[PDB]
Structures are given as C-alpha cells and as structure tokens.
C-alpha cells in the first residue's frame, strides 16, 4: 500500500496549504483531500497535528469553494476515526465547522454538519464545545434546507444538544425552531427525518416555553398526520409528543382529523397507544365543545366505554378514559346523546364499579363527576340506582366529611364531599332515588353541610335538600333538623346557586 509515501508527503503539503499562492493552497487542498480518501494515507493525515491544523485554517479562511469543499471533505473523512475526531477537536475544528454552517455551498454544509454530528456522538467535550460556538443558532437556521438526508442529520444534532439542556431548548425556541420543525413534519415523507424531528419536538414538548410555540405553530395537527404511519417509532414519538403538548391545545381548531385518529387508536392492541390516546382525548375534550361534539360524532362514547372495560383496574387507562366520558357528558349540544350512549354501550355497571376499591381517590373523583353527568339523563336514574350508585356515593360522602374534620392521594376530601352531594343532587330528581337517599339517613349530614364555609358545598347541600323537600315527609325531616337557621343565612349569599337553592328549600318548608 501507499503508507510510506503518505508520511513523506504530509510535511510538504502542510507548507503548501499555508502558502501565499491561493492556487498552490488549492492544488494542495485537492491532493490532501485525495490522500484522505484512502485508509493507508488517511491514518498518515490524522497522525499530523500540523497538517490537521492547516486543513482547519484553510477551510475556515478560504474563498475557493473547491478548497472549502476539499478541506471540509478531508475533515468529514478524518471524523470517521478516533484519532481524526480528537485531531479535529484539538485543532479548534468545532468553531471552524460551526462557521462553515453559514456556507452557501451545499457540499460544504453537508461535510460540516456530518463532521459536527460524528463529534457530538463520538468525542467527549464536543457537546459543550458546539453549544459555546453558537452551533444551535446555525443548525436551527439550516432547518429551511430541502435535502431530507441533510435535515435528518441537522435535526439529530439539535436533539443531542437540546436533550437535558434547558438553555439549548430556549435557544432553539428563540431561533424559530418549533415552526421549522412543525413545517418539516407536514412536508417530507422521509421516515428517518420525520422520526428524528418528532424526537426533537418531544424533548421540546416538556419545556413550558416551547410547548405553546409548538401548538401555535400547528404542531398538534402536523404530528397528527403521522399517527397511522407504518413506522412504530414514528407513531409512538408523535403520540408521546401530542400527549406532552395536549394540555396546551384545548383552544386549537382544525383538530377533527387528530380526534378521529385518537378514537381509532383507542382500539390498538398496544396498551401504550390506548393510554396516550385516552390522555390526549381527555385533555382536548377539556372545556372545548367543538372537540366534545366531534369525538361524539366518530363513535367516541362507545370507544371510551370499551377502553374502560378493557382497562379494568389499570388506573393509568381508566382515569383519563373516565375524565373524557365526564367532559363528553356535559355542556355541549350532544351531551344528552352521550349520557344515553354510555348506558346503551353497557357503561353504567363498570362506571359504578369504579367507585369501589381498588380505585384510588383521583379515579373515584372523576367517576363521581361522570355519574353526576350520567344522572342528568332520566333514563339513567333507575339503572344507576339498580347498580347501587346511591349507597356507595353516600358512603364516600360520609368518610370524606369525617376525614375533613381533622388531603389524601393528591385529592382534597372537601372535593369528594362536593362531588358526591352534587351526584346525589341530580339522582334526587327521581322519586325512587329520593326514598333510597332518605332511607340512608343522610338529611342530617346535608343540613350540617349548609354550615360549610365552601360556597360549592353550600350549593349542592341546598341542592339535594331542595329536591328532597318536594315530599312532605322530607320537608318535615329537614325542618326538624333546624335547617331554617343556616338556610336563611345562605339566602343573602353572593353566590347565585347557593341563594337560589336556599330560597327553594325554605319555600317548600313554609306556611
């Protein structure tokens, strides 16, 4: 092989590169490049600190595109070896290469970004080095190029540098990262680039700065395009990102495509896919009635009821599935259809079951909120009674009220007291439900709740009592508990619900 010749050549070629004649520099740059193309002589170049330092200074300071291309090309080749990568680093190559990410030669940009890529992965010190040389700003600026292989390398450098570095995330945000990354997701079909870009947006999705910029750049809809891709890793990184973003996207429009796919993904064999879909749907159905309607239009109620059945005790599925059903069963034109659909798709038994152990407080709290909504539909009154909702709602209520007189699993018991009394307020619309509720000897507790300093507890207590006091026997029980005392104080409340309900109970107890 060459070997011998390569070594004797380097010393001369180094001197030629540092020459005044920019024609001699250029012919040297070309033969240096050519040597770098054979393993024999490539090892020669990497052994020579002076030669590598000469290549980095030529590239950085040349005006021949040919010698920019050739010198960068040489660094590309050196960067495939341990000796070469350390050489480039020690020769101050990282600042040089970052300068070359402003080149208006495509071959130079390619060689530059691949070299920095090999350094970021294979040379300790290079991540901090590239960051301090302003590599992020240069790389985000390059996200407007159109070569899918180049972009795949650029987005991969951005992911490496953004990961667990909150300054780099803010630099990517401040340089216009999110808009560029979203634009990639809705232009290119190249799986490696889409995947790498989805992984960048994932790192950024947990940053409370970037999160809203990604959503406003139209990132929900763009990531949405890819949820039915053949590539698992693409779909999964998109799902994870959407989940991270979803709580900031409740006010986005044009989300019908997404919501349709998420209802379809509830049916996945992969329980991770089902769980992310449930959580995203939970968030996007949060106070947005267009979303609530769209999810109902595409079989959402049935699909969620089936997720809850499928999930069993796995509370990571049931909590967001139940919150979604809760959001879908209230405050939108199709809330009444949904309340019926839960019953017709055999949801009521599983829903009432989830009020019991082993359910934890957050699921029980969501389940109470849902039962409260389901009970707005009169056709649910008897079914819910028959599944024993009422005695279990009263048992939760008493415990919460006893617990509050000294909270648990990241839920306030004051919150269980409101929910349960609210659900009982609505169920109490049915005369058979009222007989059961009275039968549990609850009127004394309801009256003590009128002494709660919490407006919302005052309102539901006065609420259920107002329903009970329809019937002579209850109106007499309520009066006998000295309810007129707190009720006439709640008369003069700033809260409309409280004062309106207080007045109703009082009227139903008067001469």
């Amino acid at each position: 092989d060459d070997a011998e010749l390569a070594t004797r050549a380097i010393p001369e070629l180094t001197k030629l590169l540092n020459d005044e004649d920019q024609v001699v520099v250029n012919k040297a740059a070309v033969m240096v490049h050519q040597l770098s193309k054979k393993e024999a002589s490539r090892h020669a170049i990497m052994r020579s600190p002076q030669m590598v330092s000469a290549i980095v200074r030529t590239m950085q300071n040349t005006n021949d595109v040919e010698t920019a291309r050739c010198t960068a090309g040489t660094l590309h080749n050196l960067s495939h070896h341990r000796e070469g990568l350390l050489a480039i680093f020690k020769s101050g190559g990282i600042p040089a290469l970052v300068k070359m990410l402003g080149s208006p030669v495509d071959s130079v940009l390619f060689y530059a970004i691949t070299t920095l890529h090999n350094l970021l992965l294979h040379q300790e010190g290079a991540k901090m080095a590239v960051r301090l040389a302003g590599g992020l700003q240069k790389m985000v600026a390059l996200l407007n190029k159109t070569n899918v292989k180049f972009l795949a390398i650029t987005t991969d450098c951005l992911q490496i540098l953004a990961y667990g570095n909150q300054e780099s995330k803010l630099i990517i945000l401040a340089s216009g990262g999110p808009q560029a990354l979203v634009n990639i997701m809705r232009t290119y079909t190249y799986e490696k680039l889409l995947w790498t870009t989805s992984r960048v947006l994932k790192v950024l999705s947990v940053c409370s700065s970037n999160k809203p910029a990604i959503v406003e750049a139209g990132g929900m809809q763009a990531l949405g395009l890819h949820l039915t891709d053949p590539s698992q890793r693409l779909v999964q990184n998109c799902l994870w990102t959407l989940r991270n973003l979803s709580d900031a996207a409740t006010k986005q429009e044009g989300m019908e495509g997404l919501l349709g796919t998420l209802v379809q993904l509830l049916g996945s064999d992969d329980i991770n896919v089902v769980t992310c879909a449930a959580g995203i749907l939970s968030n996007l159905t949060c106070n947005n009635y267009k979303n609530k309607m769209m999810v109902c239009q595409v079989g959402g109620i049935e699909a969620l009821v089936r997720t809850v059945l499928r999930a069993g005790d796995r509370e990571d599925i049931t909590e967001p599935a139940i919150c979604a059903l809760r959001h879908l069963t209230s405050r939108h034109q199709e809330a009444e259809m949904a309340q019926n659909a839960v019953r017709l798709h055999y949801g009521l038994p599983v829903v009432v079951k989830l009020l019991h152990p082993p359910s934890h407080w957050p699921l029980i709290k969501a389940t109470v909120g849902l039962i409260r909504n389901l009970a707005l539909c009169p056709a649910n009154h008897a079914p819910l009674r028959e599944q024993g909702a009422i005695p279990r709602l009263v048992q939760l209520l008493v415990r919460a009220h006893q617990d509050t007189q000294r909270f648990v699993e990241g839920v306030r018991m004051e919150e269980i007291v409101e929910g349960c009394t609210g659900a009982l307020h609505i169920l109490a619309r049915d005369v058979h439900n009222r007989i059961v509720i009275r039968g549990l000897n609850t009127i004394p507790l309801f009256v003590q709740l009128l002494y709660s300093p919490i407006e919302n507890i005052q309102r539901v207590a006065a609420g259920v009592l107002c329903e009970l006091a329809q019937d002579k026997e209850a109106a007499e029980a309520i009066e006998a508990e000295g309810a007129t005392a707190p009720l006439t104080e709640l008369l003069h409340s700033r809260n409309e619900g409280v004062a309106t309900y207080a007045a109703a109970v009082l009227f139903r107890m008067s001469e």
């Binding site: 940053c207 709580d247 968030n283």
Partner: peptide
C-alpha cells in the same frame, strides 16, 4: 410526570 389541573367543570392532565 403528570399534574392534575381543574379548569372550571373540566380537568387537564399536564404530562414531563
């Protein structure tokens, strides 16, 4: 991780 935030009648599960 996950944080629960009530938004009037409805709730948000904030996922990192």
């Amino acid at each position: 991780x996950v944080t629960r935030n009530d938004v009037x009648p409805d709730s948000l599960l904030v996922f990192x």
